[PDB]
A and B are shown apart, each in its own frame.
Chain A
C-alpha cells in the first residue's frame, strides 16, 4: 500500500508566502524522491521542482528564487514554500514521488547520456486561489424532497469563496446516489453549489438525512437535516 494526500490554505493575497504539505503512506520520504506539479485552469501542467535527501534538490528556473522546497524527517511529510505569489500562481497543485532513470545514446564515459525522471504516483490535488478578495463561508438552506416508485432529495449551498467544498452525506455513510453538481460563480465573486441524492418511495423515517459540508478556508461545517 502507498498513497498521497496534498493540503493547503486554499487562498493567498498578492505577494505572500504560499505553503503546502503532502501526507505520505506506505513508503517514507528518505526512501524516495519528491516533486510538485501545478496546473492552472484549462492549461498544461508546469513541473515545479524536485527534492531528496543529500541535497539533490534542484528547481524550475522559470520559478527561480521565490520557490523553496524542503522536508520533515520525523513527521514524514513533504513541504513547499513559494514567495512573491501572484495571479499567475493560481493553480491546482500536486505532490508526487518522482522516479529517475538513465537514457544512453553514446559512450557512458564520454558522459553521453542524461538523467530523466517521471512521476508515477500522484495525490488528489490542492486547489489554491490567489485574490485580494476575502474568504466567505457557505450559507446552507437544504432542498426539501418534492420535484410511489422513486423520489429525489437535495442539499443547496448558497454562497461562498473560494472553491472547493466537500459534501458527504451522513458524514460519509450515505454514499450511493449522490450526483453533487459543480459550482457556479456569481458577479459578486461568490460560488454556489448543490448536492442531490436519489431515494426510493421507502423514505418515511424518521431517517438521518444530512449533507455534512466542509469549507476548510473558513473552517465552516454547516450540516443541515432534511425531510418532507
Chain B
C-alpha cells in the first residue's frame, strides 16, 4: 500500500493521486513535511500561491478518464516529503478525506554514518533503585540501524527498548536505545556497551561505572 517515488537531484519527478477522473474537477495538492504540518502547494489544478515557486506542475481539471498528476521539476533535497491530493469531481460527491499519500525520495543523498553518544545512569536515577544507560544515534543516512548491547563481552537480550528510525526535518535520521538494569548490577560489571550497526560500519560506545 505505501507508495514511493525516487529520482536523481535536478531531475523532474512525477506523482499521481486519487481515483480516475469522471467530470471536470478541481484538485488541491499538499505537502506533509515529516514532523511539520501539511502545506498547501497547489490550490487550483495548477495554481500556486506565495511561498511556493514553480514548477510544481499538475494535471488540469479539463480532462476525463484521466489520473491526477503532480510534476515536480528541478528537484532538491528539500522537496523530499509526503504529498496528498483533494478531489472535487462534478460527478462524484465531496471527498472528505485527502487521497492516499505518495512519498517522494530523491537519490544519492549524503551517505552519512551516525553520531552515537552513550550516557551512563545519572546518580539521581541510581538512587531510585532503577538504572538505565542510553545511547543516542544521530545523523545517519539511511535510517536502517540495528543496535545490540553487551554486558562487557557477553551480549544482552532482555530489557532492551528501541525506537524506530525517524527522519528529522534536516536530512538526517534519529533513533535511541535503552535497557533496564539494577544499580548494583551496573556497578558490578566492568563496562556495558552499545554497538550500533550501520549499512556496513559498526560503531562501538562503552561506558564503565565509577
Contact = CB atoms under 8 A, between A and B. Distances in A.
A and B touch in the complex (CB under 8 A): yes
Interface of A: 37, 39, 44-47, 60-62, 94, 99, 101, 103, 105, 112, 114, 116, 118-125, 139, 141-144, 146-147, 152, 154, 156, 158, 179, 181-184, 186, 192, 194, 196
Contacts of A47: 95-98
Which of B61, B100, B119, B120 neighbours the largest number of chain A CB atoms within 10 Å of its CB? B119
A173 B41 CA distance: 33
Given A143-B122, A156-B119, A103 B25 contact: yes
B125 A158 contact: yes
B107 interface: no
A3 to B, nearest CB: 12
B174 A192 contact: no
19 contacts: A39-B38, A44-B99, A44-B101, A45-B98, A46-B97, A47-B96, A47-B98, A101-B26, A101-B43, A114-B88, A122-B38, A139-B128, A152-B117, A179-B174, A181-B136, A181-B176, A182-B163, A194-B134, A194-B136
Contacts of B109: none
Contacts of B154: none
B122 A141 contact: yes
Contacts of B67: none
B66 interface: no
Interface in B122-139: 122-125, 128, 130, 132, 134, 136, 138
Contacts of B97: 44-47
Contacts of A62: 96
A129 B93 CA distance: 31
Contacts of A194: 134, 136, 176
B24 A103 contact: yes
Given A44-B100, A47-B96, A120-B40, A147 B120 contact: yes
Contact of A118 (B28, B122, B123, B162): B28
Q: What is the predominant secondary structure among interface residues of chain A facing chain B? A: loop
Given A179-B136, A196-B136, 11 more contacts: A44-B97, A103-B25, A114-B88, A118-B40, A142-B122, A147-B117, A158-B130, A179-B174, A181-B163, A181-B175, A184-B162
B37 A103 contact: no
Given A181-B163, A184-B178, A158 B132 contact: yes
Nearest to B95: A47
B84 interface: yes
Given A147-B117, A147-B207, A45 B174 contact: no
**By CB atoms of chain A within 10 A, which of B97, B163, B174 has the most?**
B97
A147 B207 CA distance: 8
List the 10 closest A-B pairs by CB distance, nearest first. A141-B125, A141-B124, A105-B24, A143-B119, A122-B37, A46-B97, A118-B28, A103-B26, A141-B122, A116-B88
A186 B119 contact: no
Contacts of A45: 38, 84, 97-98
